[PDB]
Design a protein around this ligand. Structure first.
Ligand SMILES: C=C1CN(S(=O)(=O)c2ccc(C)cc2)CCCN(CC2CCCCC2)CCCN(S(=O)(=O)c2ccc(N(C)C)cc2)C1
Ligand SMILES: [Mg+2]
Lengths: 61, 444, 59, 50, 67
């Protein structure tokens, strides 16, 4: 449920980019759900997906 | 009946004491009846009325479940004005109970003519009157409780509670009961679970025990209980399906609310009416056929014969179009009579779907009505006028009603096909009936 | 759609085509009084907008 | 003016976005001294400079 | 011919119905367990009251048969 930077270090670039793409599409779905009216549970997840994207990008760089 | 200040724990206690008032009538057997040879006008018909045999409340819920329709029918043609003042109000509720006594008199005519109560001459006019009056007293405690509840002392509506502890209790008895029935093959208790434990003592062989576990036709089969839990679970998952509509206050910022549109927009009315039409087609056909027979039309409606099914023989629509509408008795019966088997599905599915679609517009739950409601609660949707409110609601409401009817019909059909304990109509009533109680309790 | 002010019509067309694997007939963009760019994306005739909106989540 | 530049339109957009009142859940935080938005601007009264 | 207008109500019905199914929110797994446990404890309590009812059935009908 929680994406952490400790276990992303050994992985190589390809699956890191794949996971980044999955996080991006999840974030887009979260945003459209927020606009059309969704549960507070889905609203709260936006920050966690944004921070997971930040973690993945930081590890890549 | 008046109203007073009440609190939630006192409210559940009031639901409790009302349910034991129901239970003392449900448990105690009636006296003065000495005719048990027939005892099968319709199993399904009894369920809708929550009626009983040889019990205090065998009277049924018919009057309380119809009298209300008469008041609504008069209002539509505006024949009479219902109470709009407290003294006028304190009348219809009661007068309806008095009209219920007239409905009980109709039941007394039905009881003597059907012959389940007995021959009219053998009881005699006076003795027939004594039993009819005594049944009305058992019904009357329910009818006065209905007025007490109608005012609001009772939680919601008691009609659901009577079914809630009527169709479910029977499933609970089938699951475990300490009475033993012996054909001499083995010693087993009435409860399906107890019967399996008794079978293990009866037979050392593991294979015979698994054969009994799969198939135990004379007693409730163990497999049926497993199916009953599975069908309850699938109906729960279907019950959850909802549509979230962004609803916002007309004068506040950043306020996010959702107006829920559940898949089952009509919660139980399609099934209560449907379980009602299928029971009726059969109930009149058996009664009319017995009084007057040898007419091609009455045989064409239905032919009736009783075959024992792990209990007393049940009159089946052996002949007539009601047979095609009638359920398939066995998986082999579906193979042997796909026609009636299938007809049995289109009529039930279609009736619920038609009854739902029509129920949403009968009860004032249409998109326009609910939009008007949201208007009197100063509720709006973001970036939308009220006409678009109606249009947005229309995108879901009729489709939601139709597919809710379709889903409940399909779920009942699947539950019956899997051979779970109890009628599919009964299982449907139980889940929705508990859910209305569940929402009130969570609301507390 | 709502997009950012740094997107060309070509970029919007390409982004929609990749994200939603559909075809775009044309794009008309304006900049709202509040700041972000609003894009009207007209699809090919053989694609209807209602089913794409279904797949999106807005109905 | 209907004819306007991109930066002028952007500045106008920011100023318009800034003109909303405070959220009702602000004033009943703990360490709060704000009663209302005191920087609200009306188009008739103050003329935005420019 | 007329068969297209016969099946078009069915066609739009299934189309808008699977559309609604796409729109309808699904119960979450944690929510599924929560609601299932709530319905299960409700089942248990009504089963308990019904067990008491069916067990007190026996003495009262035994008495009635006796008198
Ligand atoms: C009230 C009814 C309903 N009916 S109905 O007659 O067609 C009828 C219909 C419409 C109206 C307006 C009135 C009556 C049909 C369903 C019969 N289910 C079958 C049960 C199923 C389980 C296993 C035992 C049998 C029993 C429900 C009670 N029954 S009852 O058992 O037959 C009965 C009731 C009272 C007496 N007494 C002593 C007066 C005797 C028998 C009647
Ligand atoms: Mg001036």
């Amino acid at each position: 449920a929680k994406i952490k930077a400790r276990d992303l270090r050994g992985k190589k670039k390809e699956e890191l980019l794949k996971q980044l793409d999955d996080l991006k599409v999840e974030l887009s779905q979260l945003r459209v759900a927020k606009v059309t009216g969704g549960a507070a549970s889905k609203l709260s997840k936006i920050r966690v997906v944004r921070k997971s994207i930040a973690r993945v990008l930081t590890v890549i760089n | 009946k008046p109203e007073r200040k009440i609190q939630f724990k006192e409210k559940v206690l009031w639901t409790a004491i009302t349910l034991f008032i129901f239970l003392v009538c449900c448990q105690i057997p009636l006296f003065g009846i000495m005719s048990s040879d027939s005892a099968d006008p319709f199993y399904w018909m009894r369920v809708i009325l929550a009626s009983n045999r040889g019990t205090l409340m065998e009277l049924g819920i018919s009057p309380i479940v119809t009298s209300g329709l008469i008041m609504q029918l008069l209002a539509g043609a505006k024949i009479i004005e219902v109470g709009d003042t407290p003294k006028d109000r304190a009348l219809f509720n009661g007068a309806q109970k008095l009209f219920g006594m007239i409905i009980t008199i109709g039941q007394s005519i039905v009881y003597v003519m059907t012959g389940m109560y007995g021959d009219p001459s053998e009881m005699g006019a006076g003795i027939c009157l004594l039993i009819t009056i005594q049944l009305f007293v058992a019904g009357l405690i329910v009818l006065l409780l209905d007025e007490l509840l109608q005012k609001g002392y009772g939680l919601g509506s008691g009609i659901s509670l009577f079914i809630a502890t009527n169709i479910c209790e029977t499933i609970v008895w089938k699951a475990f009961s300490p009475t033993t029935v012996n054909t001499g093959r083995g010693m087993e208790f009435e409860g399906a679970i107890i019967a399996l434990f008794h079978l293990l003592a009866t037979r050392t062989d593991k294979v015979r025990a698994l054969r009994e576990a799969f198939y135990r036709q004379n007693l409730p089969n163990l497999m049926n209980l497993i199916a009953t839990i599975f069908v309850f679970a699938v109906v729960i998952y279907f019950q959850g399906f909802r549509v979230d509509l962004p609803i916002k206050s007309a004068r506040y910022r950043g306020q996010y609310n959702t107006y829920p549109i559940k898949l089952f927009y009509t919660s139980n009315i399609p099934i209560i009416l449907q379980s009602a039409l299928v029971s009726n087609l059969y109930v009149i056909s058996q009664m009319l056929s017995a009084r007057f027979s040898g007419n091609l039309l009455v045989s064409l409606l239905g032919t009736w014969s009783d075959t024992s099914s792990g209990g007393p023989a049940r009159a089946y629509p052996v002949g007539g179009l009601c047979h095609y509408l009638s359920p398939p008795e066995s998986f082999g019966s579906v193979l042997e009579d796909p026609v009636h088997a299938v007809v049995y599905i289109v009529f039930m599915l279609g009736s619920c779907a038609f009854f739902s679609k029509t129920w949403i517009e009968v009860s004032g739950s249409s998109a326009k009505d609910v939009a008007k409601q949201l208007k009197e609660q100063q509720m709006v949707m973001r970036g939308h006028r009220e006409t678009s409110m109606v249009h947005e609601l229309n995108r879901y409401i009729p489709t939601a009603a139709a597919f809710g009817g379709l889903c409940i019909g399909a779920l009942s059909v699947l539950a019956d096909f899997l051979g779970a304990i109890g009628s599919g109509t009964g299982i449907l009533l139980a889940v929705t009936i508990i859910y209305q109680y569940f929402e009130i309790f969570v609301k507390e | 759609f709502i997009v950012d002010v740094k997107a060309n019509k070509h970029q919007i067309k390409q982004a929609v085509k990749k994200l939603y694997d559909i075809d775009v007939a044309k794009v008309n963009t304006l900049i709202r009084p509040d700041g972000e760019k609003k894009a009207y994306v007209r699809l090919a005739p053989d694609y209807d907008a209602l089913d794409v909106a279904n797949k999106i989540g807005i109905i | 003016s209907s004819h306007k530049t991109f930066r002028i339109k952007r500045f106008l957009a920011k100023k318009q976005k800034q003109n909303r009142p405070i959220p009702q859940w602000i004033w009943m935080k703990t360490g709060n001294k704000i009663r209302y938005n005191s920087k609200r601007r009306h188009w008739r009264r103050t003329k935005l400079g420019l | 011919d007329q068969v297209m207008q016969f099946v078009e109500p069915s066609r739009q019905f299934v189309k808008d119905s699977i559309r609604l199914v796409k729109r309808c929110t699904k119960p979450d797994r944690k929510e599924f367990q929560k609601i299932a446990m709530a319905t299960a404890i409700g089942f248990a309590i009504m089963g308990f009251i019904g067990f008491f009812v069916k067990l007190i059935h026996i003495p009262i009908n035994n008495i009635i048969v006796g008198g």
